[PDB]
Write a protein that binds this ligand. Structure first.
Ligand SMILES: Nc1ncnc2c1ncn2[C@@H]1O[C@H](COP(=O)(O)OP(=O)(O)CP(=O)(O)O)[C@@H](O)[C@H]1O
Ligand SMILES: [Ca+2]
Ligand SMILES: [Mg+2]
Length: 893
């Protein structure tokens, strides 16, 4: 039986003894069958998840509300009296109400737990001698885990290989300085504090630099500080500010409703009316007017938006970011990953002498050739191009195999061009001795390699990079084999050629070589191509046209970036560009007045990205920046809508950013805006419908009380109307697919409220129309002195039909009834049908007849009510149509 090794003992114990105890193969990894056995015995590589879900507890918690308690008290006091039919009716009504509330809460909790836990932790592991790609959830104590830069440590590792490792342990230790890691055993005297353990990698820490490979010593709860981990991250309350605003609005509406109910009670009691019946009616109205489904529906619509985002490759965490996601003003993205595909090929070759050579072929394939202006070259014919491809081979770091690329796209394109000429065998012929790492701030890499067949000649350097960083280190050039020196008369024409290459759609680079890396010989430039991704130009145009001001932050040259922006809709006739030196000269103040006028940035850095973020946030704008680097993590954290990458993004940037895309494309941002605006529109629909229904009911009750005639609503019918107003139909209205025409609207403001003048006017119009219809029904209904329950049933049916028709036309503030389709959201149709059958059963069920005192009606009366109750829908449709037509005509003219 394998024992679990503690962190301190693993640090104390030698690596070989540790591997002996865990029976782990450091080279070939661990086999799958033993992986399954260890997983079965030790559980999975997860945190022990346990919580109380005693459904009877949440059933009881649905009770104890003051409204339900008062209803139960009224039921008890009626039981104490001589009446029992009212008591049984009220208790079955409150039972239906609490069951509806229970299913609403259950659905809300269900959506809550389908939310989150959607980005599993993923890390490398060695099994059966192969580096295989598993989730961290699959780990067992004994596997060999490879750690890379930017990867999050999945479990406690006993490090045995490490070259210049720095691990950010600020999360678990609080030290802002990453801790260097070693592999030697640690002394017992220094094994006291956590930070002194320099040979163990802890789960949840981020690797900042270096390479590593260790064996898991702990999984799940046995891991050190796992206790404090489940202490902090297990429970949290990240309340969305939109939820707070909705709660405040609901509380204000509830206070106003309570004031209205109190005024109505005072007026009725001062007028000498009923006591118990009026009290029950008032308490039913109070429980009706309270918006209780608003938080449930907002959680449901947030979860639905997140799920719809995920269904089409848009993973969004950090729930309250979605609320401000729709209020997007400025969008920034790179140019190699999000706008154009990462498929680079070289189609132009330029040398020191000057010969326009064109290269054909698309992709990393060997079908292709180099075409000078009339020649046939398949070998050592032109010395300049041969030297260029040889330098490309020497400076190359990646390796191409079976038409596959594993490395940076630029080196892949260079090696593909080299293989096209037939010199693929020179990549491994030269062996590097001194290596110069390539960096964003450096923009050039150098190698020191010599031929192995002969070593009489001294060392020769081969380096490539940007032209601005190449001509500075190069003052010699070749014409016909011999070495000469360049002057200004060649630098100017080289600059013109660089600009010409940067035009159209080509990328500009430079090749240099020499004996010592202080004086080289210029070779020429390579015309790497970069085709834009399909369906990006129209997306960019339709984004910038409406309300967005997308900018460009790319590391290319001036001409290349300008041409790429001109191909899309980013560049205009009034836009400028800021260089890296210029953006470094000014920190915040001088950059503020120029950021809204520049859409293309020169070769920048993560520090420059931070500067742009600070300048944009100073002006008061929302920025959505996408990054794929370790040093872009701070930029993503500072940005409110920072986006990470799935395939080209590290784990550090994945965790730091609030949005992760499994595919790099400039199409999910419009999708983010569309779902955000759609869920906002659904919330507006719910709010408008609930407010209109509540206002109509309260106005009808107030007019009934003030005019001194019995109210044709009772209490059970009021409870049914309440269930309709915030229940299955209200949630059906809240659940709605995103409208196609929702992107042609200026971005929303974060400080804007939910109630507008148009919404208030529509609510008032609908309420007054419903009230007028009910008054007309009553006037045509009571033409004598005899009052029957049939009249009350007819009034209740008219009110139900009016509410249903209002909900029918409340699913679109701008679209018509037939524009979205009669059957688009099947949930709404199902709810309407269920309400219809429930009303019919209430009318025609002897038990429900006794409960609801509905008596009976006729087919002709029902048809007349249906014909009359359609007034709200037609009026709303015509006013919406005329308003939309007038707005479109005015904006067109
Ligand atoms: N393998 C390589 N060797 C030498 N230079 C390289 C290189 N890859 C890129 N460069 C140089 O680095 C410069 C800027 O590159 P950087 O990596 O900062 O951004 P980038 O090339 O990835 C474009 P972007 O950031 O918009 O995706 C380019 O002009 C290029 O000349
Ligand atoms: Ca209510
Ligand atoms: Mg970049």
């Amino acid at each position: 039986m394998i024992p679990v090794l503690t962190s301190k003992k693993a640090s104390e114990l030698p690596v070989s003894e540790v591997a002996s105890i865990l029976q782990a193969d450091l080279q070939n990894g661990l086999n799958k069958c033993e992986v399954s056995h260890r997983r079965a015995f030790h559980g999975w590589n997860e945190f022990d998840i346990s919580e109380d879900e005693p459904l009877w507890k949440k059933y009881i918690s649905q009770f104890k509300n003051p409204l339900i308690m008062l209803l139960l008290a009224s039921a008890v006091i009626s039981v104490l009296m001589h009446q029992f039919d009212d008591a049984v009716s009220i208790t079955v009504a409150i039972l239906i109400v609490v069951t509806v509330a229970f299913v609403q809460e259950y659905r809300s909790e269900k959506s809550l737990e389908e939310l989150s836990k959607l980005v599993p932790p993923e890390c490398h592991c060695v099994r059966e001698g192969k580096l295989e790609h598993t989730l961290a959830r699959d780990l067992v104590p004994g596997d060999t885990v490879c750690l890379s830069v930017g990867d999050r440590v999945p479990a406690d590792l006993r490090l045995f290989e490490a070259v210049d490792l720095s691990i950010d342990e600020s999360s678990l230790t609080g030290e802002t300085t990453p801790c260097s890691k070693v592999t030697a055993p640690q002394p017992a005297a220094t094994n006291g504090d956590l930070a002194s353990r320099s040979n163990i990698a802890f789960m949840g820490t981020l690797v900042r630099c270096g390479k590593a490979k260790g064996v898991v010593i702990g999984t799940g709860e046995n891991s050190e500080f796992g206790e404090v981990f489940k202490m902090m991250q297990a429970e949290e309350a990240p309340k969305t500010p939109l939820q707070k605003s909705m709660d405040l609005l609901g509380k204000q509406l509830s206070f106003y409703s309570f004031g209205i109910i109190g005024i109505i009670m005072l007026v009725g009691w001062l007028l000498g009316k009923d006591i118990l019946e009026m009290f029950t009616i008032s308490v039913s109205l109070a429980v009706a007017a309270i918006p209780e489904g608003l938080p449930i529906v907002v959680t449901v619509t947030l979860a639905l938006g997140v799920m719809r985002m995920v269904k089409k490759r848009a993973i969004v965490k950090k729930l309250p970011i979605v609320e401000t996601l729709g209020c997007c003003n400025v969008i920034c993205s790179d140019k190699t990953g999000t706008l154009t595909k990462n498929e680079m090929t070289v189609t132009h070759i330029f040398t020191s002498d000057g010969l326009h050579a064109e290269v054909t072929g698309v992709g990393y394939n060997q079908f292709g050739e180099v075409i000078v202006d009339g020649d046939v070259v398949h070998g050592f014919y032109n010395p300049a191009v041969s030297r260029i491809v040889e330098a490309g081979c020497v400076c190359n770091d990646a390796v191409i195999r079976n038409n596959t690329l594993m490395g940076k796209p630029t080196e892949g394109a260079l090696i593909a061009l080299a293989m096209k000429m037939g010199l693929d065998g020179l990549q491994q012929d030269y062996i590097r001795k001194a290596e110069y790492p390539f960096s964003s701030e450096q923009k050039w890499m150098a190698v020191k390699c010599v031929h192995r067949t002969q070593q009489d000649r001294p060392e020769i350097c081969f380096m490539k990079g940007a032209y601005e960083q190449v001509i500075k280190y190069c003052t010699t050039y070749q014409s016909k084999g011999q070495t000469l020196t360049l002057t200004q008369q060649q630098r100017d024409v080289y600059q013109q050629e660089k600009a010409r290459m940067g035009s159209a759609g080509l990328r500009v680079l430079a090749l240099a070589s020499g004996p010592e890396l202080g004086q080289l010989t210029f070779l020429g430039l390579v015309g790497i191509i970069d085709p834009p991704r399909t369906g990006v130009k129209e997306a960019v145009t339709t984004l910038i046209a409406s309300g967005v001001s997308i900018k460009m932050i790319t590391g290319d040259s001036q001409e290349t970036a300008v041409a790429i922006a001109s191909r899309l809709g980013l560049y205009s006739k009034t836009s400028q560009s800021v260089s890296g030196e210029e953006i470094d000269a000014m920190d915040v103040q001088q950059l503020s007045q120029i950021v809204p006028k520049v859409a293309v940035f020169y070769r920048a850095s993560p520090r420059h990205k931070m500067k742009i973020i600070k300048s944009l946030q100073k002006n008061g704008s929302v920025v959505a920046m996408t990054g794929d680097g370790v040093n872009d993590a701070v930029a993503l954290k500072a940005a409110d809508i920072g986006v990470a990458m799935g395939q080209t993004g590290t784990d550090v940037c994945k965790e730091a950013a609030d949005m992760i895309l499994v595919d790099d494309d400039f199409q999910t941002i419009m999708s983010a805006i569309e779902e955000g605006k759609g869920i906002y529109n659904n919330i507006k629909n719910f709010v408008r419908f609930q407010l209109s229904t509540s206002i109509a009911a309260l106005t009808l009750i107030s007019l009934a009380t003030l005019m001194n005639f019995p109210n044709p609503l009772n209490a059970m019918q009021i409870l049914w109307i309440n269930i309709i107003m915030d229940g299955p139909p209200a949630q059906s209205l809240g659940v709605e697919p995103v409208d196609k025409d929702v992107i042609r609207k200026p971005p929303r403001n974060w400080k804007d409220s939910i109630l507008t003048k148009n919404l208030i006017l529509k609510i008032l119009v609908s309420s007054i129309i419903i009230v007028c219809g009910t008054l007309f029904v009553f006037w045509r209904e009571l033409r004598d002195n005899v009052i029957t329950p049939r009249d009350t049933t007819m009034t209740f049916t008219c009110f139900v039909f009016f509410d249903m028709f209002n909900a029918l036309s409340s699913r679109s503030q701008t679209k018509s009834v037939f524009e979205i389709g009669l059957c688009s959201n099947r949930m709404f149709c199902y709810a309407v049908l269920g309400s219809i059958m429930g009303q019919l059963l209430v009318i025609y069920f002897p038990p429900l007849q006794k409960v609801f005192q509905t008596e009976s009606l006729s087919i002709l009366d029902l048809l007349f009510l249906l014909g009359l109750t359609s007034s709200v829908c037609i009026v709303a449709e015509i006013i919406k149509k005329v308003e939309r037509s007038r707005e479109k005509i005015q904006k067109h003219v």
